[PDB]
């Protein structure tokens, strides 16, 4: 055992958040935590990745209970996943400046993943968590190592070529989720149709009210050639600086 191990006694599970299986609770009596119950060695591989990763915009591993029944413990993100946040009562007041900020924060987390030579493989709004003051943090490292086809770059879906560049593809798809309040990508298209179309050069259009400059950023993330796509470093700086350098005369609309 390493120094991330704790006694199971120290964990008070309370409110069930999700199943499939995450709980809200307390650790050592004072600490609000999230706890993920459950091959049990493939379940521990997630915590393995999470021990190596530490960044303000990645959900923080606190502790493991490496003996069955097993638990992974992290910081608690008060507002649940981005997907549900976007589609629920909060979503309707989110405008472009809040949404590009959330995206900058996600980009920043992924820039860290990029610097560390990791790949996420499951980057999407269902795998981002929201806290207080609209903090967004990259979650779910089950497929991370040193797939829903609608978010997955073609080379990775077909041939198994997952790289930081296919995460960049996924990020472009996540930007459509932000700007549509979390609608499923490629409306009215099934998986197979998405495959066929994307291969014939099809890309989703500019969502209503989304500046063309942001849609152009999506299209760059969606370059057929993985090496043509921008880095997260570029994405983070572009999105941080957006309302000064790229759309200085942005005007608020009904939806964005
Ligand atoms: C599904 C969900 N998670 C929430 N917070 C979480 N923080 C961290 C989470 C997590 O899974 N950590 C983790 C673990 C433990 C292991 C490996 C990897 C990881 Cl990343 S889950 C809050 C939440 N709420 C329900 C809806 N409510 C509606 C608001 O009105 C808000 C509150 N629901």
Give me the CATH number covering residue 19: 3.30.200.20
Instruction: Assess if residue 255 is contained within a domain.
Output: no
Burial class (CB in 10 A: 0-12, 13-18, 19+), 87: middle
R_g over Cα of the chain: 19
Cα–Cα distance measured from residue 130 to residue 83, given in angstroms and rounded to the nearest whole number: 10
- Please tell me whether residues 37 and 145 are part of one structural domain: no
Tokens of 113: 């993943």
Q: Which residues of 33-43 are buried (b: 16+ CB within 10 A; e: fewer)?
A: bbbbeeeeeee
Residue with tokens 């350098």: 245
Domain residues for 197? Answer: 77-249
Cα–Cα distance measured from residue 115 to residue 58, given in angstroms and rounded to the nearest whole number: 14
The CATH number covering residue 135 comes to 1.10.510.10
Method underlying the structure: X-ray
- Please tell me whether residues 27 and 99 are part of one structural domain: no
Asked if 150 and 176 touch (Cβ cutoff 8 Å), the reply is: no
Which residues does the annotation place in the binding site? Answer: 17-22, 36
Q: How many helices (H) and strands (E) does the chain have?
A: 9, 7
- Please tell me whether residues 171 and 228 are part of one structural domain: yes
What are the C-alpha distances in Å from 116 to residues 7, 101, 110, 113, 192?
A: 30, 23, 10, 5, 34
Tokens of 120: 């996420």
Tokens of 35: 């706890």
- Please tell me whether residues 63 and 42 are part of one structural domain: yes
- Please tell me whether residues 213 and 102 are part of one structural domain: yes
Burial class (CB in 10 A: 0-12, 13-18, 19+), 254: exposed
| Substitution site in 11, 34, 78 for ligand 1 pocket (most atoms within 8 Å of beta carbon) | 34
Q: Is 18 in the pocket of ligand 1 (CB under 6 A)?
A: yes
Instruction: Assess if residue 211 is contained within a domain.
Output: yes
Which ligand 1 atom sits closest to the C-alpha of 36? 15
Answer with the one of 13, 47, 76 that is the final residue of a domain.
76
Give the residue among 26, 72, 30, 15 at the shortest CA–CA distance from 49. Answer: 72
Q: How far apart are the first and last CA of the chain?
A: 50
Instruction: Assess if residue 35 is contained within a domain.
Output: yes
Helix (H, G, I), strand (E, B) or coil at 185: coil
Cα–Cα distance measured from residue 178 to residue 103, given in angstroms and rounded to the nearest whole number: 8
- Please tell me whether residues 175 and 72 are part of one structural domain: no
Instruction: Assess if residue 183 is contained within a domain.
Output: yes
Answer with the one of 25, 46, 76 that is the final residue of a domain.
76
The resolution in Å comes to 2.2
Which residues does the annotation place in the binding site for ATP? Answer: 17-22, 36
- Please tell me whether residues 72 and 90 are part of one structural domain: no
16 CA distance to ligand 1 centroid (A)? 10
Give the residue among 32, 101, 88 at the shortest CA–CA distance from 60. Answer: 32
Answer with the one of 57, 76, 95 that is the final residue of a domain.
76
What are the C-alpha distances in Å from 60 to residues 50, 52, 118?
A: 8, 11, 16
Number of domains in the chain: 2
């Amino acid at each position: 055992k390493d120094a991330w191990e704790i006694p199971r006694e120290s964990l008070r599970l309370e409110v069930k958040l999700g199943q499939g299986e995450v709980w809200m609770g307390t650790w050592n009596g004072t600490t609000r935590v999230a706890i993920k119950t459950l091959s049990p060695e493939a379940f521990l591989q997630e915590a393995q990745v999470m021990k190596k990763l530490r960044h303000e915009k990645l959900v923080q591993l606190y502790a493991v209970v490496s003996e069955e029944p097993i638990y992974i413990v992290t910081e608690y993100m008060s507002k649940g996943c981005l997907l549900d946040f976007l589609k629920g009562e909060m979503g309707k007041y989110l405008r472009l400046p809040q949404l590009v900020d959330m995206a900058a924060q996600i980009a920043s987390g992924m820039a860290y993943v990029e610097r560390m030579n990791y790949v996420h493989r499951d980057l999407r709004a269902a795998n981002i968590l929201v806290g207080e003051n609209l903090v967004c943090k990259v979650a779910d490292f089950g497929l991370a190592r040193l797939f829903p086809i609608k978010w997955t770059a073609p080379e990775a879906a077909l041939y198994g070529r997952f790289t930081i560049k296919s995460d960049v593809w996924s990020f472009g798809i996540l930007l459509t989720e932000l700007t549509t309040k979390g609608r499923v990508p490629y409306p009215g298209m099934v998986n197979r149709e998405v495959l066929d179309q994307v291969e014939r050069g099809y890309r989703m259009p500019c969502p209503p009210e989304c500046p063309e400059s942001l849609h152009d950023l999506m299209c760059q993330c969606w370059r057929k050639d993985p090496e043509e796509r921008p880095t997260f470093e570029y994405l983070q700086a572009f999105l941080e600086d957006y309302f000064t350098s790229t759309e200085p005369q942005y005007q608020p609309g009904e939806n964005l």
